[PDB]
Amino acid sequence: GPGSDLGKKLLEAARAGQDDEVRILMANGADVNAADDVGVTPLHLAAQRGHLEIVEVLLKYGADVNAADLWGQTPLHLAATAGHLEIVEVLLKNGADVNARDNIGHTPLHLAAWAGHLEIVEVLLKYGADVNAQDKFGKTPFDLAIDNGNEDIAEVLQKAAGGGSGGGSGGGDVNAYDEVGWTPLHRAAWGHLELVEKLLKNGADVNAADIDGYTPLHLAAFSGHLEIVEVLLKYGADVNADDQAGFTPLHLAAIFGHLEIVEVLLKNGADVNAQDKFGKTPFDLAIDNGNEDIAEVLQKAA
Amino acid sequence: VSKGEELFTGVVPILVELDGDVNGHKFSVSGEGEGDATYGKLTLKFICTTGKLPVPWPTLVTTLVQCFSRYPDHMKQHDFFKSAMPEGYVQERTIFFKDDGNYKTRAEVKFEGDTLVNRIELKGIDFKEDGNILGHKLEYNYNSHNVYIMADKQKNGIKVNFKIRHNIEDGSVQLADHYQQNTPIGDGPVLLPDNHYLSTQSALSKDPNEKRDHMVLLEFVTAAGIT
């Protein structure tokens, strides 16, 4: 009753950054370790929303620096995600667990590298953050940095792992794959022509299939990138790859109306009689999707 | 800046209500929490308010708010989900469980005041009583997926396709094939995207202080595939 009412007001005041309210509520008996029904504490909210002075007063009066909500998040996770450098430093100075894991397995380093906060990455590393930590999906902070295009952070993290310079341009294995079976070439196939070329020159497996059976050529045909399709075929892509996919690249091109891709696939040996898992040929799908030019070409291809 | 977008610049409260019927077993689920599209992040907790859930919790994850996906700045013009807000969108799915029954769902996702609400009707049929779903043989965990998004210009909406992988307690995997379409509720113009994908990560957990049948869900989703 009275206490959880005060605790709730303190949660709201900490979230809102109301320093004077926080003082008054604490003086009137609001528990600094008040937690709502999902484990969120005033320190979580002050840290998340960037209210440094409140963070400091809560810690001064005994707030648990490593309190975890139901999702496994500590105040450091939230401050690292949000980019609040000074709060991150205050939390670490007060004994925050630098390698705490949220329920996905993210450490604060994962989240700061994901969200693009370089100075926080460096601070975490200086407080003992584990650069090799993997979350439950096998991702390191380096992987997440590169996944979100945070090249400067990726460069820093590779060096801290002992992998030398150059990490801003990707890891050391062109054929590394994640839990969905995606290689760098799968990622590049969505329009990054220069990277597709570089990866293939550096030994990328052109026919790698993901967990759903999709090769880079499928993804390039789905996303409509003619020049990438051409390059993949030039480096030996299987024009008729299916294998658990349940369709070929030619099926995708016929659905989405990519005439030049259809023609390139045919010129490279695509099979016009291939049936998807509903028994449809590319010609059937062009008809179904009202793609007249493509249907004509496929009907001419016999 | 844009209209629907601007509703998601910060933390948004979420309410989920699911009315279900699988092989005649009726149930209701309620969820609440918060989403922050800046990070593609959901923190939610769900309760089966009717009692014991008659299907495994992981099978309901996809049914239980893609407007919270992080669309990076260079892809803002491809974010159908937020562009339909606040009036929202209808999300319909058929989910085929390989060698088992199927779910059909219809949801309305929209703002009610300052809360984003997902209200769902689910019907499940043709499930085997000794299958992985009604037999509760699915592990309490969740995998990462790629969600494929295409415009349906003819219908002023999008089509979405993906395969969900459910780990089985014996070590196999139960495939749940998802066919999805979304259509705006309002008559205002929406964004119709070029083909792209979402990458998803989720973790399911339990609240040690919760006596009801329940699921704690942490979720991160990011859009990609446009250069």
Author numbering:
A (entry chain A): 9 to 310
B (entry chain B): 1 to 64, 68 to 230
What text appears in the publication on this structure?
DARPins are engineered proteins that consist of 4–5 structurally similar repeats that stack on top of each other, forming a compact protein domain. DARPins combine all potential advantages of single domain binders over antibodies: they are small in size (ca. 18 kDa), possess high biophysical stability, have very high expression yields in E. coli, can easily be genetically encoded for in vivo applications and are devoid of disulphides and hence well suited for applications where they are expressed in the reducing cytoplasm. Structural investigations showed that these DARPins bind to different but slightly overlapping epitopes.
To connect 3G124nc and either YKKD or YRLK we chose flexible GS-linkers. Therefore, two linkers of 7 and 11 aa named GS7 (GGGSGGG) and GS11 (GGGSGGGSGGG) were tested for linking 3G124nc with either YKKD or YRLK. The resulting four constructs were named gc_K7, gc_K11, gc_R7 and gc_R11 according to whether they contained YKKD or YRLK and the linker used was 7 or 11 aa long. The complexes crystallized under various conditions with different unit cells and one to four complexes per asymmetric unit (AU). All GFP-clamps form 1:1 complexes with eGFP, in which the clamp indeed wraps around approximately half the eGFP molecule and creates a continuous large interaction surface, similar to the superposition of the two parental DARPins on GFP (Fig. 4(a,b and c)). The buried surface area (BSA) of the GFP-clamp complexes is 1625 ± 72 Å2. Between 7 and 11 hydrogen bonds were found in the different structures. Hydrogen bonds of Trp79 from the GFP-clamp to Leu44 of eGFP, Trp79 to Leu220, Gln81 to Lys41, His114 to Gln204, Asp143 to Gln204, Asn156 to Arg73 and Phe226/230 (numbering for constructs with different linker lengths, respectively) to Asn198 seem to be the most crucial ones, since they are found in almost all complex structures. The structures of the GFP-clamps confirm the intended design: both DARPin-derived domains overlay well with the parental DARPins when superimposed on eGFP. Most interactions between the DARPins and eGFP are found in the single DARPin complexes as well as in the GFP-clamp complexes, confirming that both domains can bind their respective epitope without strain or steric hindrance.
